[PDB]
Write a protein that binds this DNA or RNA. Structure first.
Ligand SMILES: [Mg+2]
Ligand SMILES: [Mg+2]
Ligand SMILES: [Mg+2]
Ligand SMILES: [Mg+2]
Ligand SMILES: [Mg+2]
Ligand SMILES: [Mg+2]
Ligand SMILES: [Mg+2]
Ligand SMILES: [Mg+2]
Ligand SMILES: [Mg+2]
Ligand SMILES: [Mg+2]
Ligand SMILES: [Mg+2]
Ligand SMILES: [Mg+2]
Ligand SMILES: [Mg+2]
Ligand SMILES: [Mg+2]
Ligand SMILES: [Mg+2]
Ligand SMILES: [Mg+2]
Ligand SMILES: [Mg+2]
Ligand SMILES: [Mg+2]
Ligand SMILES: [Mg+2]
Ligand SMILES: [Mg+2]
Ligand SMILES: [Zn+2]
Lengths: 224, 129, 88
RNA sequence: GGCGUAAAGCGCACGCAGGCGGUUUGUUAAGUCAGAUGUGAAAUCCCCGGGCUCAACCUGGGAACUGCAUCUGAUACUGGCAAGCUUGAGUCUCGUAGAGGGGGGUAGAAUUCCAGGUGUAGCGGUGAAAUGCGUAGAGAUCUGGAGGAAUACCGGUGGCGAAGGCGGCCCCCUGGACGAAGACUGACGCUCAGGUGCGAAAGCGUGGGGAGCAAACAGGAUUAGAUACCCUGGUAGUCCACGCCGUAAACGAUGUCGACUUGGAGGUUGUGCCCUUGAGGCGUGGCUUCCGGAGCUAACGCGUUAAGUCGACCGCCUGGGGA
């Protein structure tokens, strides 16, 4: 992606001065209007370097977990994630998805049993409450685990929208040695992130840019 | 008051290092400059400079490795409240020789290793590892 | 404290000039003057303890200056205290 | 090794002796360092051997006696000496904020009291009462006067001071703090056992003063009792002058000074800049409150006002009770 290309989306916009985490001094151009302005000189080479390692990982059949549970961007992360044959977490992250995977894995089995049964097993003969009551369960599981339902194992990398919002997921990764690629906004802590991508992590236009870029390079790395 | 400027030097290093500072600066002195020389020569800092003539400010460029400070510990030994002197055959070694002790001799400031090899003792200024 | 006219005047009397405003002799003369003025103040206001701690500071401070001078130039010291009529 | 909450920071400050002391040159060579020489009794200890059948034991030689002294050198650091240096510390000028201290004036609110007008049977007090006060007219209301004590609103994690502590207004005498600019002195500095001074309240002595409050004391109640808690009174005291006392959970339960180490929001008080063009915009000092990062911590928590990282000096602790 290009410096020119990024600037338009507003990747350069950050949070206010009052909410910054000092660790992110190197990546801030300066500030204007009591808002921090990130350095796009720093962003692009670091971002491109993120894409390269992702491209490498994807080319050894690596599994990529997109994580971004902001309500505003939840859908964009999904389409971004599905467009490259990978996996996602787009609603509230259940603590222990990775560290307690063996237990959370059971819920995945439950998911499949449910949509399989509701279709091929079909039922539709119910009791009248089970139609919604089982759908209720299935509805819930889908948002929670729809994106990793077929992940099978532990992912080989995490891509994360907002390191502070998703601090839980990034911490589990850290414990399992899984590398973390993350959009890390001026207010966040970049310590948990192996490849830090510093830019806005809210605005749907900015979010889609990195994500659109991320999903595209996976396919290149896939297409070989 | 400022009665030990060498401890001050040690500490400015230690704290800026802990604070992942690129450099540290302090009022200069021959004795500081002699110690900075040993640190640099033994690879505990990058380099150093003194700037000005009438009020010389000495500047040390610190050194980092694996996102780690090269200087692990840096402590004052002899001090205004308790001078420590050693003989050649009594010279301490730090970390079994992995670190160094800075020693001040009749032939100027050098490491425990140097002074040992040159048959000398002196005032033990500090330990560094 | 001392008036600007009375301060300037002593600096003239004991300094190398009008601007030699920090020489030891000058500093000690100025303290002397203010101590002796304040002799009057505490004669009437014996219960003004707080101010007295300030006077006692002028004293202990003049004592340190006089000792430094004595150490550095006894001849300059003797003159200075005789001239200020001190020590008894 | 310790001293915020576990034992432990003197209630606070000044300061002699003492300890420590910024930076440059030269000098000295006491400290320190090197070498040489002498001495460090033997035995013992230790090492390798030898002798008693082995072992204990005896024994040869060594090593060790880490120490002292003399001489000769080395001169980086410490000390002495001499000249300095200006950044520490002072002095000077002009301003700013402040319940900082001492003295003298003065003000309006209220209580109680005294003297009257109106008025008439209650007031007061409590959980409920009673003691108490009122027809010698209370209480309530209006008016005039005496006296003492304290200063509503302003008022605020506001301000000042070493601590104790300091609050109506005005003047006089006076201490400290901070800012701006530049000149001057030239390490004059930090700490401080002993010493000296300050030091809430209560208490003490003499003489004043005395409205309100109130130990003691008396009376009414409560209660099984009630030497209390509640009520009606009320003396010392609380107030002034001059002396004494020298103690408090005298507390941040955190000694003083200096250097260094990420941040956010405020309060207070200087000062430089900007169409002052708005009650602002950009900086830069002093103090202060609330969060919080690393680090620290037994935890609680502390966290640039440190309980973090260091140095100088002081005070203090060494299981509970006894004390
Ligand atoms: Mg202990
Ligand atoms: Mg507390
Ligand atoms: Mg205690
Ligand atoms: Mg104290
Ligand atoms: Mg010579
Ligand atoms: Mg034998
Ligand atoms: Mg033997
Ligand atoms: Mg022998
Ligand atoms: Mg012997
Ligand atoms: Mg010298
Ligand atoms: Mg009245
Ligand atoms: Mg004044
Ligand atoms: Mg001069
Ligand atoms: Mg009395
Ligand atoms: Mg009573
Ligand atoms: Mg009495
Ligand atoms: Mg006591
Ligand atoms: Mg805090
Ligand atoms: Mg913490
Ligand atoms: Mg005991
Ligand atoms: Zn954000």
């Amino acid at each position: 992606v290009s410096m020119r290309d990024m600037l338009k989306a507003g990747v350069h916009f950050g949070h206010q001065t009052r909410y910054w985490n000092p660790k992110m001094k190197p990546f801030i151009f300066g500030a204007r209007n009591k808002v921090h302005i990130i350095n796009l000189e720093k962003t692009v080479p670091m971002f491109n370097e993120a894409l390269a390692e992702l491209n490498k990982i994807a080319s050894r059949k690596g599994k990529i977990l997109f994580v971004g549970t902001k309500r505003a961007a939840s859908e964009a992360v999904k389409d971004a994630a599905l467009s490259c044959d990978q996996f996602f977490v787009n609603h509230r992250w259940l603590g222990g998805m990775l560290t307690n995977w063996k237990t959370v894995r059971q819920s995945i089995k439950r998911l499949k049993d449910l949509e399989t049964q509701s279709q091929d097993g079909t039922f539709d003969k119910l009791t009248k409450k089970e139609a919604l009551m089982r759908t209720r369960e299935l509805e819930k599981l889908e948002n929670s685990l729809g994106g990793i339902k077929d992940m099978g194992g532990l992912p080989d990398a995490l891509f994360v929208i907002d390191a502070d919002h998703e601090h839980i997921a990034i911490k589990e990764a850290n414990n399992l040695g899984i590398p973390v690629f993350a959009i890390v906004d001026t207010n966040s802590d970049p310590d948990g992130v192996d490849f830090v991508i510093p830019g806005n992590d809210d605005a749907i236009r900015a979010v889609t840019l990195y994500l659109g870029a991320v999903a595209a390079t996976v396919r290149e790395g896939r297409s070989q | 008051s400022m009665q030990d400027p060498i401890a001050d030097m040690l500490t400015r290093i230690r704290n800026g290092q802990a604070a992942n500072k690129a450099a540290v600066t302090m009022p200069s002195s021959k004795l500081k400059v002699a110690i900075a020389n040993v640190l640099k020569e033994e690879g505990f800092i990058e380099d150093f400079k003194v700037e000005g003539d009438t009020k010389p400010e000495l500047e040390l460029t610190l050194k980092y490795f694996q996102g780690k400070a090269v200087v692990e510990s840096i402590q004052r030994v002899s001090r205004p409240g308790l001078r420590i002197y050693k003989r050649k055959d009594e010279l301490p070694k730090v970390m079994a020789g992995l670190g160094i002790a800075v020693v001040s001799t009749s032939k100027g400031v050098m490491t425990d290793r140097a002074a040992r090899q040159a048959g000398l003792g002196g005032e033990i200024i500090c330990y560094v590892a | 404290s001392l008036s600007t006219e009375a301060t300037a005047k002593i600096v003239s009397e004991f300094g190398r000039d009008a601007n030699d405003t920090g020489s030891t002799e000058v500093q000690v003369a100025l303290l002397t003057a203010q101590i002796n003025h304040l002799q009057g103040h505490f004669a009437e206001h014996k219960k003004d303890h707080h101010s007295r701690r300030g006077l006692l500071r002028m004293v202990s401070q003049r004592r340190k200056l006089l000792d430094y001078l004595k150490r550095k130039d006894v001849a300059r010291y003797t003159q200075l205290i005789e001239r200020l009529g001190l020590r008894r």
